[PDB]
PDB file of C-alpha atoms in Angstrom:
ATOM      1  CA  UNK A   1     -51.938  27.706-120.332  1.00  0.00           C
ATOM      2  CA  UNK A   2     -53.127  31.247-119.617  1.00  0.00           C
ATOM      3  CA  UNK A   3     -56.921  31.517-119.691  1.00  0.00           C
ATOM      4  CA  UNK A   4     -57.480  28.010-118.328  1.00  0.00           C
ATOM      5  CA  UNK A   5     -54.976  28.575-115.517  1.00  0.00           C
ATOM      6  CA  UNK A   6     -56.905  31.695-114.515  1.00  0.00           C
ATOM      7  CA  UNK A   7     -59.960  29.487-113.995  1.00  0.00           C
ATOM      8  CA  UNK A   8     -58.058  27.140-111.688  1.00  0.00           C
ATOM      9  CA  UNK A   9     -57.435  30.001-109.266  1.00  0.00           C
ATOM     10  CA  UNK A  10     -61.146  30.817-109.543  1.00  0.00           C
ATOM     11  CA  UNK A  11     -62.102  27.778-107.477  1.00  0.00           C
ATOM     12  CA  UNK A  12     -59.010  27.927-105.266  1.00  0.00           C
ATOM     13  CA  UNK A  13     -59.222  31.351-103.620  1.00  0.00           C
ATOM     14  CA  UNK A  14     -56.243  32.309-101.458  1.00  0.00           C
ATOM     15  CA  UNK A  15     -57.558  32.742 -97.916  1.00  0.00           C
ATOM     16  CA  UNK A  16     -56.180  35.505 -95.775  1.00  0.00           C
ATOM     17  CA  UNK A  17     -57.058  38.684 -97.655  1.00  0.00           C
ATOM     18  CA  UNK A  18     -58.257  40.539 -94.564  1.00  0.00           C
ATOM     19  CA  UNK A  19     -59.576  37.776 -92.420  1.00  0.00           C
ATOM     20  CA  UNK A  20     -59.995  38.370 -88.729  1.00  0.00           C
ATOM     21  CA  UNK A  21     -61.193  35.006 -87.450  1.00  0.00           C
ATOM     22  CA  UNK A  22     -62.647  31.781 -88.876  1.00  0.00           C
ATOM     23  CA  UNK A  23     -65.690  29.836 -87.675  1.00  0.00           C
ATOM     24  CA  UNK A  24     -65.768  26.064 -88.150  1.00  0.00           C
ATOM     25  CA  UNK A  25     -68.698  23.869 -87.103  1.00  0.00           C
ATOM     26  CA  UNK A  26     -67.295  20.655 -85.621  1.00  0.00           C
ATOM     27  CA  UNK A  27     -70.761  19.209 -84.979  1.00  0.00           C
ATOM     28  CA  UNK A  28     -71.373  19.201 -88.728  1.00  0.00           C
ATOM     29  CA  UNK A  29     -74.370  21.496 -89.152  1.00  0.00           C
ATOM     30  CA  UNK A  30     -73.232  24.856 -90.530  1.00  0.00           C
ATOM     31  CA  UNK A  31     -70.747  25.483 -93.399  1.00  0.00           C
ATOM     32  CA  UNK A  32     -67.358  26.961 -92.516  1.00  0.00           C
ATOM     33  CA  UNK A  33     -67.214  30.754 -92.791  1.00  0.00           C
ATOM     34  CA  UNK A  34     -64.461  33.365 -92.461  1.00  0.00           C
ATOM     35  CA  UNK A  35     -64.843  36.591 -90.485  1.00  0.00           C
ATOM     36  CA  UNK A  36     -62.880  39.528 -91.880  1.00  0.00           C
ATOM     37  CA  UNK A  37     -62.133  43.162 -91.278  1.00  0.00           C
ATOM     38  CA  UNK A  38     -60.301  45.796 -93.322  1.00  0.00           C
ATOM     39  CA  UNK A  39     -56.994  47.125 -91.992  1.00  0.00           C
ATOM     40  CA  UNK A  40     -57.657  50.722 -93.019  1.00  0.00           C
ATOM     41  CA  UNK A  41     -60.893  50.679 -91.057  1.00  0.00           C
ATOM     42  CA  UNK A  42     -59.141  49.172 -88.041  1.00  0.00           C
ATOM     43  CA  UNK A  43     -56.342  51.748 -88.084  1.00  0.00           C
ATOM     44  CA  UNK A  44     -58.739  54.610 -88.813  1.00  0.00           C
ATOM     45  CA  UNK A  45     -61.246  53.514 -86.170  1.00  0.00           C
ATOM     46  CA  UNK A  46     -59.856  54.808 -82.875  1.00  0.00           C
ATOM     47  CA  UNK A  47     -62.792  53.425 -80.892  1.00  0.00           C
ATOM     48  CA  UNK A  48     -63.245  50.371 -78.669  1.00  0.00           C
ATOM     49  CA  UNK A  49     -64.778  48.215 -81.403  1.00  0.00           C
ATOM     50  CA  UNK A  50     -64.550  48.297 -85.199  1.00  0.00           C
ATOM     51  CA  UNK A  51     -66.356  45.392 -86.858  1.00  0.00           C
ATOM     52  CA  UNK A  52     -68.644  42.888 -85.157  1.00  0.00           C
ATOM     53  CA  UNK A  53     -70.257  39.695 -86.437  1.00  0.00           C
ATOM     54  CA  UNK A  54     -73.668  38.416 -85.369  1.00  0.00           C
ATOM     55  CA  UNK A  55     -74.477  34.699 -85.432  1.00  0.00           C
ATOM     56  CA  UNK A  56     -77.806  32.923 -85.095  1.00  0.00           C
ATOM     57  CA  UNK A  57     -80.949  31.656 -86.817  1.00  0.00           C
ATOM     58  CA  UNK A  58     -81.414  35.109 -88.371  1.00  0.00           C
ATOM     59  CA  UNK A  59     -80.710  35.310 -92.152  1.00  0.00           C
ATOM     60  CA  UNK A  60     -79.488  38.830 -91.439  1.00  0.00           C
ATOM     61  CA  UNK A  61     -76.992  37.694 -88.903  1.00  0.00           C
ATOM     62  CA  UNK A  62     -73.466  37.717 -90.209  1.00  0.00           C
ATOM     63  CA  UNK A  63     -73.663  33.962 -89.570  1.00  0.00           C
ATOM     64  CA  UNK A  64     -76.533  31.739 -90.705  1.00  0.00           C
ATOM     65  CA  UNK A  65     -76.886  28.754 -88.374  1.00  0.00           C
ATOM     66  CA  UNK A  66     -79.955  26.872 -89.571  1.00  0.00           C
ATOM     67  CA  UNK A  67     -83.131  26.038 -87.664  1.00  0.00           C
ATOM     68  CA  UNK A  68     -82.451  25.141 -84.030  1.00  0.00           C
ATOM     69  CA  UNK A  69     -85.007  26.143 -81.395  1.00  0.00           C
ATOM     70  CA  UNK A  70     -82.283  25.968 -78.745  1.00  0.00           C
ATOM     71  CA  UNK A  71     -80.595  28.819 -80.625  1.00  0.00           C
ATOM     72  CA  UNK A  72     -81.795  32.420 -80.914  1.00  0.00           C
ATOM     73  CA  UNK A  73     -82.073  34.608 -84.042  1.00  0.00           C
ATOM     74  CA  UNK A  74     -78.749  36.143 -83.059  1.00  0.00           C
ATOM     75  CA  UNK A  75     -77.309  33.566 -80.709  1.00  0.00           C
ATOM     76  CA  UNK A  76     -73.858  35.106 -80.474  1.00  0.00           C
ATOM     77  CA  UNK A  77     -71.834  38.069 -81.747  1.00  0.00           C
ATOM     78  CA  UNK A  78     -68.084  38.606 -82.259  1.00  0.00           C
ATOM     79  CA  UNK A  79     -66.373  42.018 -82.114  1.00  0.00           C
ATOM     80  CA  UNK A  80     -62.916  43.112 -83.259  1.00  0.00           C
ATOM     81  CA  UNK A  81     -61.135  46.205 -81.977  1.00  0.00           C
ATOM     82  CA  UNK A  82     -58.519  45.343 -79.351  1.00  0.00           C
ATOM     83  CA  UNK A  83     -54.818  45.771 -80.135  1.00  0.00           C
ATOM     84  CA  UNK A  84     -54.782  42.867 -82.576  1.00  0.00           C
ATOM     85  CA  UNK A  85     -56.830  40.649 -80.269  1.00  0.00           C
ATOM     86  CA  UNK A  86     -60.455  39.618 -80.769  1.00  0.00           C
ATOM     87  CA  UNK A  87     -63.571  39.733 -78.595  1.00  0.00           C
ATOM     88  CA  UNK A  88     -66.460  37.269 -78.442  1.00  0.00           C
ATOM     89  CA  UNK A  89     -69.867  38.488 -77.290  1.00  0.00           C
ATOM     90  CA  UNK A  90     -72.660  36.090 -76.400  1.00  0.00           C
ATOM     91  CA  UNK A  91     -76.158  37.256 -77.385  1.00  0.00           C
ATOM     92  CA  UNK A  92     -78.348  34.168 -77.055  1.00  0.00           C
ATOM     93  CA  UNK A  93     -81.649  33.822 -75.228  1.00  0.00           C
ATOM     94  CA  UNK A  94     -80.373  30.701 -73.448  1.00  0.00           C
ATOM     95  CA  UNK A  95     -76.679  31.583 -73.412  1.00  0.00           C
ATOM     96  CA  UNK A  96     -73.371  30.965 -75.169  1.00  0.00           C
ATOM     97  CA  UNK A  97     -70.830  28.368 -74.067  1.00  0.00           C
ATOM     98  CA  UNK A  98     -67.067  28.215 -74.169  1.00  0.00           C
ATOM     99  CA  UNK A  99     -65.514  24.747 -73.965  1.00  0.00           C
ATOM    100  CA  UNK A 100     -68.378  23.595 -71.754  1.00  0.00           C
ATOM    101  CA  UNK A 101     -68.218  26.708 -69.597  1.00  0.00           C
ATOM    102  CA  UNK A 102     -71.110  29.123 -69.936  1.00  0.00           C
ATOM    103  CA  UNK A 103     -70.051  32.772 -70.190  1.00  0.00           C
ATOM    104  CA  UNK A 104     -71.931  35.924 -69.200  1.00  0.00           C
ATOM    105  CA  UNK A 105     -74.354  36.998 -71.929  1.00  0.00           C
ATOM    106  CA  UNK A 106     -73.664  40.261 -73.774  1.00  0.00           C
ATOM    107  CA  UNK A 107     -70.196  39.986 -72.244  1.00  0.00           C
ATOM    108  CA  UNK A 108     -66.872  40.587 -73.993  1.00  0.00           C
ATOM    109  CA  UNK A 109     -64.209  37.885 -73.750  1.00  0.00           C
ATOM    110  CA  UNK A 110     -60.693  37.588 -75.147  1.00  0.00           C
ATOM    111  CA  UNK A 111     -60.476  35.278 -78.156  1.00  0.00           C
ATOM    112  CA  UNK A 112     -58.590  31.995 -77.962  1.00  0.00           C
ATOM    113  CA  UNK A 113     -56.505  30.040 -80.476  1.00  0.00           C
ATOM    114  CA  UNK A 114     -58.704  27.457 -82.161  1.00  0.00           C
ATOM    115  CA  UNK A 115     -61.242  28.230 -79.447  1.00  0.00           C
ATOM    116  CA  UNK A 116     -64.726  26.742 -79.550  1.00  0.00           C
ATOM    117  CA  UNK A 117     -68.162  28.122 -78.688  1.00  0.00           C
ATOM    118  CA  UNK A 118     -71.056  25.865 -77.734  1.00  0.00           C
ATOM    119  CA  UNK A 119     -74.664  26.977 -78.136  1.00  0.00           C
ATOM    120  CA  UNK A 120     -78.171  25.618 -77.747  1.00  0.00           C
ATOM    121  CA  UNK A 121     -77.679  24.266 -74.262  1.00  0.00           C
ATOM    122  CA  UNK A 122     -80.533  22.650 -72.421  1.00  0.00           C
ATOM    123  CA  UNK A 123     -80.657  19.222 -73.975  1.00  0.00           C
ATOM    124  CA  UNK A 124     -77.674  16.869 -74.227  1.00  0.00           C
ATOM    125  CA  UNK A 125     -78.441  16.081 -77.870  1.00  0.00           C
ATOM    126  CA  UNK A 126     -79.645  19.596 -78.747  1.00  0.00           C
ATOM    127  CA  UNK A 127     -76.401  21.478 -78.376  1.00  0.00           C
ATOM    128  CA  UNK A 128     -74.427  22.934 -81.274  1.00  0.00           C
ATOM    129  CA  UNK A 129     -70.688  23.652 -81.200  1.00  0.00           C
ATOM    130  CA  UNK A 130     -68.507  25.998 -83.211  1.00  0.00           C
ATOM    131  CA  UNK A 131     -64.723  26.368 -83.520  1.00  0.00           C
ATOM    132  CA  UNK A 132     -62.944  29.690 -83.895  1.00  0.00           C
ATOM    133  CA  UNK A 133     -59.719  29.881 -85.906  1.00  0.00           C
ATOM    134  CA  UNK A 134     -57.623  33.034 -85.593  1.00  0.00           C
ATOM    135  CA  UNK A 135     -55.681  34.201 -88.649  1.00  0.00           C
ATOM    136  CA  UNK A 136     -52.029  34.599 -87.654  1.00  0.00           C
ATOM    137  CA  UNK A 137     -51.423  36.626 -90.813  1.00  0.00           C
ATOM    138  CA  UNK A 138     -53.948  39.230 -89.699  1.00  0.00           C
ATOM    139  CA  UNK A 139     -52.227  39.595 -86.328  1.00  0.00           C
ATOM    140  CA  UNK A 140     -48.961  40.362 -88.127  1.00  0.00           C
ATOM    141  CA  UNK A 141     -50.457  43.378 -89.903  1.00  0.00           C
ATOM    142  CA  UNK A 142     -52.162  44.659 -86.754  1.00  0.00           C
ATOM    143  CA  UNK A 143     -49.035  44.092 -84.661  1.00  0.00           C
ATOM    144  CA  UNK A 144     -47.018  46.211 -87.094  1.00  0.00           C
ATOM    145  CA  UNK A 145     -49.833  48.604 -88.044  1.00  0.00           C
ATOM    146  CA  UNK A 146     -48.059  50.249 -90.985  1.00  0.00           C
ATOM    147  CA  UNK A 147     -49.526  52.744 -93.452  1.00  0.00           C
ATOM    148  CA  UNK A 148     -48.892  52.657 -97.203  1.00  0.00           C
ATOM    149  CA  UNK A 149     -51.424  55.172 -98.523  1.00  0.00           C
ATOM    150  CA  UNK A 150     -50.348  58.466 -96.957  1.00  0.00           C
ATOM    151  CA  UNK A 151     -50.029  61.520 -99.202  1.00  0.00           C
TER     152      UNK A 151
END
């Protein structure tokens, strides 16, 4: 098996190519997505932030939620730039929640392992939650920060 085997890998894509963080909806509303950033860009970018994701009801947003009034076009945004760490920025009209605790809007917070962000607060049954999964593999590359394209 040569050609057929190649097809098998087609469906099963190895995750962890350049993934920064992963977003998983535990409330069962939005499909799981994976946030990623290129190493070269991270090493080259000597600024505070490098790549940031925007989440919300906006089809432009790096993350497409769905159709919840409690959520804004761009409910929340995630930025990556720290020394291997990640930053979560809330950008909702009503606010972004962390494990039941509401954080300061447009504020940067240190990412957490398997953390979770709650949004659409106002109604007990109208709140949506999201889980953040950090890629340990990515941290390894950033922690070492080695170059292999210098000439």
